[PDB]
Amino acid sequence: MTTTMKISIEFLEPFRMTKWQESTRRNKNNKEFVRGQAFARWHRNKKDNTKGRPYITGTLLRSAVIRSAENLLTLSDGKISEKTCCPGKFDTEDKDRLLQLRQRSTLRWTDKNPCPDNAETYCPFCELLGRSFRIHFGNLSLPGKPDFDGPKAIGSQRVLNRVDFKSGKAHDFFKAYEVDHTRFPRFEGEITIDNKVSAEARKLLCDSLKFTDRLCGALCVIRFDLAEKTAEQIISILDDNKKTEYTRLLADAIRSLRRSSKLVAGLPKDHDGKDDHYLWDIGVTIRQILTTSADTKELKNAGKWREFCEKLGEALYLKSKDMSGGLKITRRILGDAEFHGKPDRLEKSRSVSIGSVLKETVVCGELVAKTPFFFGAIDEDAKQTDLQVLLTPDNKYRLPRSAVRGILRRDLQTYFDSPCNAELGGRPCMCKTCRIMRGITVMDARSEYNAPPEIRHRTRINPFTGTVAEGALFNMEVAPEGIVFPFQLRYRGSEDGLPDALKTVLKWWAEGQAFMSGAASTGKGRFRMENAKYETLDLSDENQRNDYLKNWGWRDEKGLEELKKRLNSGLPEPGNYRDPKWHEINVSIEMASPFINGDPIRAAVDKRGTDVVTFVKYKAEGEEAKPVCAYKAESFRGVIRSAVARIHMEDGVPLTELTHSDCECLLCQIFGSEYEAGKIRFEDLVFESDPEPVTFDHVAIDRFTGGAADKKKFDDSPLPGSPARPLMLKGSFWIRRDVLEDEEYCKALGKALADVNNGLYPLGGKSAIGYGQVKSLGIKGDDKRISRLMNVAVPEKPKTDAEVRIEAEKVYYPHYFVEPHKKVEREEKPCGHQKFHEGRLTGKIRCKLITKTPLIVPDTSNDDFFYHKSYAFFRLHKQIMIPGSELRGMVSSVYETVTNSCFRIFDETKRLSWRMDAQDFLPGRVTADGKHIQKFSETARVPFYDKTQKHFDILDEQEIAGEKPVRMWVKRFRYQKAFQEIPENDPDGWECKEGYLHVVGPSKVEFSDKKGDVINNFQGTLPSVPNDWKTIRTNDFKNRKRKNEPVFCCEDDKGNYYTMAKYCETFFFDLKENEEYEIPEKARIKYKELLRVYNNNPQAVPESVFQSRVARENVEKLKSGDLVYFKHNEKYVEDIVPVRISRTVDDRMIGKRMSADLRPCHGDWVEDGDLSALNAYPEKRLLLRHPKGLCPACRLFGTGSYKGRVRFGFASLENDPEWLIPGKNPGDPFHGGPVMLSLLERPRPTWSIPGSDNKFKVPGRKFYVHHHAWKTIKDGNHPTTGKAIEQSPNNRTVEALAGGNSFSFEIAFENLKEWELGLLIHSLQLEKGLAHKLGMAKSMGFGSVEIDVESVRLRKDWKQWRNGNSEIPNWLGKGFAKLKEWFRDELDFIENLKKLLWFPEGDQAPRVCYPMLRKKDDPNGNSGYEELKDGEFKKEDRQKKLTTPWTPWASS
Amino acid sequence: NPIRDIQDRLKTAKFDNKDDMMNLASSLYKYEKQLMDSSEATLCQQGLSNRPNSFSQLSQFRDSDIQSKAGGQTGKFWQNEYEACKNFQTHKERRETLEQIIRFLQNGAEEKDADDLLLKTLARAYFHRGLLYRPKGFSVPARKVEAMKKAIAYCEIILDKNEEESEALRIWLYAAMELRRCGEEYPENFAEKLFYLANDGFISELYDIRLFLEYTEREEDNNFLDMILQENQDRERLFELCLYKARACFHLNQLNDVRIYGESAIDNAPGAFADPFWDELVEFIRMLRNKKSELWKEIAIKAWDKCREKYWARQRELYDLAFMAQDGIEKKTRIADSLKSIAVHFYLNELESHEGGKGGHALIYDPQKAEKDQWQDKSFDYKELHRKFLEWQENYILNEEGSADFLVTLCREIEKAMPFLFKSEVIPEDRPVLWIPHGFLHRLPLHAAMKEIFWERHASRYLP
RNA sequence: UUGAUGUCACGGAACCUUUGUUGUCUUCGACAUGGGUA
RNA sequence: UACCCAUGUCGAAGACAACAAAG
Ligand SMILES: [Zn+2]
Ligand SMILES: [Zn+2]
Ligand SMILES: [Zn+2]
Ligand SMILES: [Zn+2]
């Protein structure tokens, strides 16, 4: 007979579970099986299926109970109740049959020999051991024994590594399943005890059960008595609309919406405020789908909505990976396998006495995150994020026990200054750190805060090209700062309290120097122990030990709450205290320029609706998240590391060019390498005053047309910053005190920070246009060890030699073209950015800009300053400024012209089209194959819209569409008409022929908002516009007397008068089946372009009934059976048009109409092909780059692959504004009056390129001449006609400065040759009598500005800057010599540029204006565009006149 | 200039030719590699000269079957070059060369359409990568085991489809032998794969010779030893071949020429101890002793002479074999003194302790006695004495002032384990005793031996 | 779903390296439509 | 199957290209 003792185990932490092993591999020779012997096991119902439940082996509980009994017997001198306990026997002869042998020392309490092998009665400890099944430990399983699909259903496997102390890098790793105690806290089992077991043995067993504090890797208390459907819909929407390049952007943006469901309502609109956003209104649209999902009853919960967003983003990411070939993950060659400790099989035990003194000290506090933290835990099913944080199953942030123990061990080794060079396995290590750690108990903790982590984008910059390295782009989940974790630490030992090492470590933690998470180099994981309380319990005392046992050591919630009432406040004072190894350095950065830290994903969900916004981080203020603008620690660390590396050298080689393998340079010794941790840690920098971001609009200007380039119109939202109101950026970084006491490292850091303080290293992106300029940088806390290092008139511009003769009776064109030279100089390797090269110039150029004519630089943030669009002058914090981007582009154009270079901005893929005028085209019909056209023999006109016959009534829908043949009588005599039935008037001379009808609808319409001759002569009321084109009939005749020219006059409800002058359709007959002509794909592309132009026409007739079939019915491709006019060669067709007079599409893109050297160095694909077959390969870029390298402009101003070497800053007004028009308020001299401009219309390349002839090339670069039509505009009159300008929704009213306004700006140049700097200065200052053009309405006389160089400063060294005003003539001479070397005296483009830059002299006012459309529209009597088309501007000699500067087009 | 190399490759490229495709693939891989690591060659901002023809050539090359076949041929060519040039290259050069081959092939081996040449080269690349790890100390590197296991996995894919693949069967067995050397057990099907090799001949590789030797020792048959003996002795690695032939002669009962083959292997031996020959030589000596063949007593002494003339885990085992093989007590003292770095000399023989014998030998030399009895060889079991030392050492650290009891037991254990310390016959009374201990005996108090403390009868001095 | 006279697995920080960055003037005039007459 | 022209209106671009992790 026996007795059953029910056992219940309650877990207070996530316990560890080992993976299921095959029955043959459950032996001593399997390292993984032996390693997981201390963990919970997994049971499989069937050996071939993972379904099963977890359980805990009873042998593990028996071992824990035996260890607890040894400890208790050591405490009580080996006496339980009245009986005495022998030491016990832990030695067996057949050691090979035991799976595991004891490695630790056996505690000793008596010096007597163990009990005899055969004896009448055994000691209670021997009875517990089982020598006398007296005590059988049953297995522990879940209550009710449920079933789960697999181990992943109850927990997630997590990687645990072993970090080398010396290097700070993981030596190896191993994995284990962690099962959260919240989901599975209870495991139930039984203990069967024989009736012959003594009462003392039972009491010892009960005390050992109550004394067992941990099991299976966790502290325990033992008691005895839709998303996929949405993803499919979105993918189908993207595929149907042919917008699949936005898949990853949509994935990231949708995953960013998991913070709250209210973000869907705040998704950005288009720039007109309508639902036409390029992302959310692609389709039902994506915005509507997201809005429906947010309003779903199920997704009302925050957690369910977050899960929906995460799943949708993951599905879209997986779909986007399929577009690039699939999801391919690079795997480590070696070292990505788990390492398991191998225990040593020891023959005999090892008795060690630890004494009867044992005191347990409990420390309870809080660990508050002072910085964002990152505990790495990658989920194999989450591919979207590269770096992921550790979270609990309920999405709460977790402070793992393993990480806390590792950090504690690291800090103890740091305090002792003696690394533990021990290996897994063998007898326990006896070093002081290991001895302390074997008595340390830390509890796994989690946080109440559960908001989604923020994702930070990170990149690596190529030091040579200055751009992103190949494959260097990744995300990073970051836990917010301010999160509070409960902290409980217990030390059990023989000391009177905590060890001095532990006291010192805890005091370091209480000071805020608790670096406990990964990514510490970027300021991650700095905690502070707050509200710490401690108490020491003397377990040696019998009463205290009994009280400890009765309450289970106060491990549970109620026990812990009871124990916290008797904890003394504070921490023990360390007798031997050693100062922390890390020191904090405060940074104060002042910036007088806009700052942006790009966050493209946040800009896609922001209501502002911009291309990119600045980076913001979230602080955890209890249960709420606070967004704060900040400068990323990664970006600042990268900037500082680049500053250090580009200055110093290792054995004559710059630190930027080293591979850092087997390297001991100062870069690897301060910032670390891939083989060791760094010795400096940078934190986020926050702004002292929170600024409101402002939106700046940008556009790219084509070098040929002079207008906005296609697809290139953007804006950014940086943090505003001006000299009047600088941006104050504050923060701190931590440097190890061994580095801070090294003079060489302090010198290196001081040199780098002095270079940063001098403005050589701007912070953030878009530094080329004046962003991120650093005015000063302050350092405190270093005791001046690092802060120690941080500490002639310009010659007049030459007079111009260009002479332009202006005549009063002549009218000149607003713009002319500069014909480039045939030769473009290119170099394959530009200057690298990895160092300051010798023979290169670095510094700043201080310039002064003076306006010579009124200047218009609009502030387009508000388009209703004064429908009609009104703009004010650009301002930043109530200060009139000119953005650096406009100046950069203006100077770049002149630099590209002076140094004959490629057209940097040029729409190469544009395909031109020209209208036909009123013979080679022939009728045809597309064959059933669709690749051939069969020629028709002759055509006749079929009257359809007069009252002679009833063709619309008699004929059929198929017959009207032309799909089926028809029979109509045709007459030839000239009289070419085809009536279906012979008219009753003339019944003689008709012949019947079979053919097809080409009916496109009444489309020859003349529409106007005024009344013409035909409308005036109409008698009666004009009929309303009919709703069907089949019901339109002729109402009047243009030639009434002869009863010809039938027209249909109608009036619209909006006041438009329509005159349709078409009444006949064409009849195609006598088809030739033997004259099939092949359709090349080139002709198909041309016809597709013709259809695209037809369907997208701003000047189209408002009523669709007056459009052709291709435009009215939205024809998108050529189909079988179509009736078209075509021209053909011997075997193939050339041009296809749908109507008699239509557009002629160019055979080649406009990129092929210029020299192959003048095209952009890195441009698009103009050759016949797709180029999409090489997307997944790195050689596709080589087909988009010029074979010879980069032109001088692309080497200086940069390309997509090469960073530029010049930075243009904002230009600020120096004096009080002098406005062109006084304001309405005389008391406010800082705002000007409104002036209304004429219509600004798109440049037309078809004017410069008259036709398809190969003699028609790209004329060159467009420059606008200087004149004074702004006076006429100020008077309120049109510059061309002289009539008053009328307000319309298409023209603009602007606030413009006047002449005499001075601006000041600086240009920063790096690694410039002397000729490059000379040519840049030449392009800036130009010459006396020459001027630039800047801003809006350049063709109207606005924007003539002059730039004067005031000072040039050169960077001789990191510490010394020298004045460079003396070397300006030498630089100019070297630039001119370089120009002569490239082009030996054949500098004709320079003269043309100087003629176009020539500014009119005194008492010399040229008459410059665009011609009117027709001479009847010009009161001055000058010929219009139509008259010039066949007059002085014939296609034969139009480009010659357009490329000759100041060529009159009129002789009034 | 990688771009110029690609242009040159595309200038004259024929897509039916293996060499041109291999060169083009190598150029493209090198260009991509230089792009990835952000070298100085990333400053090349130029492109390809003839866009319409270069695009067509690249499109033809990037077609699936041509690209897949060219990758395997390129990997095989690099592996062939490495096998001949491995002696010339250094460790870093060899390590970088092998890892380049693995990366070039690893991106394609994951599919099911991969050819056997892709798997054979990748498995062979991993096998040679794992051989570059020098075993330092007793702990075997954990990445050598991973490399051999990774090579086996690639071979298992081919072997499942084709059980009798000639090349795949060798590499699978080559890595399986390495796993046993590291300490891992033989794979689950080692007996099957080894027996499939019986219907095969040597590929002249020296690793094949030891494969058939293991087959000889498993099935007890001697039907392959005759083929081994009739080999070419003009090869560079004659020492390894001679050692194998000695094993073949031993199973054929050619006892006379075993010494001759062993003499050449010992006399002509590589200087470096990291060579696998040294490990094989020690196993050869252990094999003779395990089979009770009274011949290892001569080879071991000769091997020690060469080893002394020239860390290595087997090195201490080699000294142990020389200590046991030598029957002269005076000579055994010199062997023990090398490792340490009335006179009583101590040497701890770990090999004999593992077998249950008295691994602790005490060498006492009394000059006043006759030459026949001048040297005495006293043997003791130090397993129990060592355990007593560990108990005192841990008790001293954990519980100070309570370890006096353990120290007394430890001192008494010395006399119980070494009864020849208080005997007048072993050591005459009233004479000084010099201590030169070995192993943990340096920390063991020898002058404090208690039975009566030792210093009451003799004086003690210590020499490190 | 373990045997038992022997489990330091609280014996092991997923750790270390990486700048959301490069390139771009809020700019600008001639086009759109397809027939009619003999 | 040879000639003849007629009408006077209207905004465009709204991001694009590369990197999408590698050691
Ligand atoms: Zn007992
Ligand atoms: Zn230790
Ligand atoms: Zn370095
Ligand atoms: Zn260029």
Side-chain angles (χ1 to χ4, degrees), chain B residues 113-156:
Chain B
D113 203 10
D115 199 325
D116 290 355
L117 183 61
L118 189 67
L119 296 181
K120 292 173 185 178
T121 309
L122 192 53
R124 180 174 295 269
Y126 271 107
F127 173 77
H128 290 75
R129 179 61 187 96
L131 288 180
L132 301 182
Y133 288 101
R134 307 303 190 275
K136 310 307 294 180
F138 292 93
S139 60
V140 51
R143 296 188 180 183
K144 176 176 180 180
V145 180
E146 176 185 352
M148 300 308 175
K149 288 187 175 180
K150 214 164 185 180
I152 283 181
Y154 290 143
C155 295
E156 287 181 357

Side-chain angles (χ1 to χ4, degrees), chain A residues 417-529:
Chain A
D417 199 3
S418 61
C420 176
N421 297 324
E423 187 63 28
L424 303 170
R427 57 178 180 269
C429 181
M430 300 305 303
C431 85
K432 25 194 179 179
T433 303
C434 282
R435 283 184 288 160
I436 295 181
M437 291 302 298
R438 283 199 297 268
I440 282 297
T441 302
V442 290
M443 174 167 287
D444 196 320
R446 63 189 59 183
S447 65
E448 305 174 2
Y449 187 89
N450 53 11
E454 55 174 337
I455 280 81
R456 298 191 180 188
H457 303 284
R458 305 174 55 187
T459 57
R460 183 178 62 260
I461 297 300
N462 194 323
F464 296 89
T465 61
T467 62
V468 180
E470 185 71 19
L473 170 61
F474 55 105
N475 310 323
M476 184 188 184
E477 287 180 4
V478 179
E481 54 181 349
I483 291 182
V484 186
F485 296 97
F487 176 74
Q488 182 181 178
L489 175 140
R490 298 197 179 190
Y491 178 81
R492 184 181 295 176
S494 59
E495 294 84 355
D496 50 356
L498 298 181
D500 292 323
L502 188 55
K503 295 177 178 177
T504 304
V505 171
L506 297 187
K507 193 171 185 304
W508 293 351
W509 289 12
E511 292 179 1
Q513 301 200 26
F515 303 90
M516 300 197 310
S517 94
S521 293
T522 61
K524 299 292 186 305
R526 193 179 63 86
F527 289 80
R528 178 185 297 183
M529 189 198 313

Side-chain angles (χ1 to χ4, degrees), chain A residues 1097-1384:
Chain A
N1097 187 21
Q1099 309 184 208
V1101 47
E1103 301 295 331
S1104 62
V1105 300
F1106 293 141
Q1107 292 186 284
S1108 298
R1109 189 194 67 90
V1110 288
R1112 178 185 66 255
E1113 299 190 11
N1114 298 88
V1115 175
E1116 302 179 16
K1117 66 178 58 181
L1118 184 58
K1119 296 185 178 182
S1120 168
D1122 290 6
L1123 282 68
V1124 291
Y1125 295 86
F1126 74 105
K1127 58 170 55 179
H1128 59 81
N1129 60 81
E1130 290 291 340
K1131 299 177 182 176
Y1132 307 90
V1133 304
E1134 299 180 343
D1135 197 6
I1136 307 176
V1137 297
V1139 289
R1140 190 68 189 97
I1141 307 179
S1142 184
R1143 317 185 59 82
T1144 52
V1145 187
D1146 191 8
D1147 302 323
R1148 304 171 302 276
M1149 298 174 178
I1150 197 178
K1152 284 300 183 63
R1153 290 197 165 276
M1154 64 193 311
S1155 303
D1157 298 4
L1158 296 176
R1159 291 168 46 189
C1161 306
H1162 298 183
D1164 300 327
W1165 184 253
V1166 191
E1167 284 74 12
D1168 290 0
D1170 52 326
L1171 207 66
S1172 303
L1174 305 175
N1175 288 135
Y1177 306 105
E1179 325 93 28
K1180 192 182 75 65
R1181 70 182 66 180
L1182 299 183
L1183 298 177
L1184 302 168
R1185 306 182 175 189
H1186 195 275
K1188 296 179 184 176
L1190 297 177
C1191 72
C1194 287
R1195 298 196 305 265
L1196 186 65
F1197 293 90
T1199 338
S1201 307
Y1202 183 73
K1203 185 184 183 179
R1205 279 148 61 240
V1206 286
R1207 298 188 284 109
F1208 285 70
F1210 280 62
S1212 63
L1213 192 65
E1214 290 178 349
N1215 302 116
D1216 289 1
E1218 301 180 11
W1219 300 104
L1220 180 64
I1221 303 298
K1224 63 179 179 180
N1225 182 22
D1228 185 15
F1230 304 104
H1231 282 85
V1235 53
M1236 185 166 55
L1237 304 177
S1238 305
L1239 270 67
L1240 288 162
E1241 285 287 338
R1242 189 207 319 177
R1244 300 296 179 171
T1246 56
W1247 184 252
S1248 306
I1249 308 177
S1252 300
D1253 203 328
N1254 291 330
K1255 62 175 181 178
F1256 296 140
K1257 306 285 188 174
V1258 173
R1261 319 172 189 267
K1262 175 185 293 179
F1263 282 93
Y1264 297 93
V1265 300
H1266 301 271
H1267 54 102
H1268 296 139
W1270 59 266
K1271 308 177 181 182
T1272 299
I1273 290 188
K1274 173 184 179 179
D1275 291 1
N1277 304 327
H1278 194 271
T1280 300
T1281 59
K1283 298 180 177 180
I1285 301 177
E1286 48 190 354
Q1287 175 176 325
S1288 62
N1290 299 336
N1291 70 332
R1292 291 166 167 80
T1293 302
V1294 297
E1295 179 192 25
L1297 289 168
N1301 294 278
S1302 296
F1303 294 80
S1304 60
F1305 63 101
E1306 282 196 347
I1307 304 172
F1309 60 94
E1310 175 187 328
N1311 290 335
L1312 264 66
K1313 303 194 66 59
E1314 300 196 13
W1315 68 267
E1316 281 179 333
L1317 189 56
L1319 290 176
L1320 182 59
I1321 294 179
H1322 176 55
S1323 307
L1324 285 167
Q1325 69 176 6
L1326 291 183
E1327 292 163 354
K1328 289 179 181 181
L1330 268 50
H1332 285 95
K1333 300 224 71 171
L1334 181 66
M1336 193 195 297
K1338 284 184 281 294
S1339 59
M1340 298 171 181
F1342 296 87
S1344 303
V1345 301
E1346 181 186 8
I1347 300 178
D1348 301 327
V1349 182
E1350 289 190 342
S1351 294
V1352 180
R1353 296 189 59 82
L1354 299 176
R1355 176 196 179 275
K1356 174 188 293 298
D1357 207 6
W1358 62 271
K1359 52 176 171 56
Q1360 181 182 348
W1361 285 63
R1362 66 182 188 92
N1363 195 28
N1365 293 9
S1366 181
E1367 309 173 7
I1368 298 183
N1370 307 327
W1371 298 334
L1372 295 174
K1374 288 198 175 181
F1376 297 150
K1378 179 63 63 179
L1379 284 185
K1380 178 180 182 180
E1381 165 189 348
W1382 285 344
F1383 325 103
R1384 38 187 58 184

Side-chain angles (χ1 to χ4, degrees), chain A residues 337-385 387-410:
Chain A
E338 310 173 24
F339 182 83
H340 297 128
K342 190 183 186 303
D344 299 1
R345 301 187 66 89
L346 299 176
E347 296 289 319
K348 297 181 179 180
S349 60
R350 181 176 62 261
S351 299
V352 173
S353 178
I354 64 174
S356 176
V357 178
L358 190 73
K359 301 179 181 180
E360 175 162 326
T361 303
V362 182
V363 180
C364 298
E366 301 166 1
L367 286 171
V368 189
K370 298 305 170 183
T371 59
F373 56 101
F374 170 82
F375 289 100
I378 300 298
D379 187 6
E380 61 177 0
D381 300 332
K383 308 292 188 183
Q384 189 171 358
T385 319
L387 305 178
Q388 310 176 19
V389 288
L390 179 60
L391 298 176
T392 66
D394 42 332
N395 289 327
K396 297 179 179 180
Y397 297 87
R398 183 185 170 188
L399 186 67
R401 174 225 81 193
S402 51
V404 177
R405 269 190 62 96
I407 297 302
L408 239 180
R409 180 180 295 271
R410 179 194 62 175

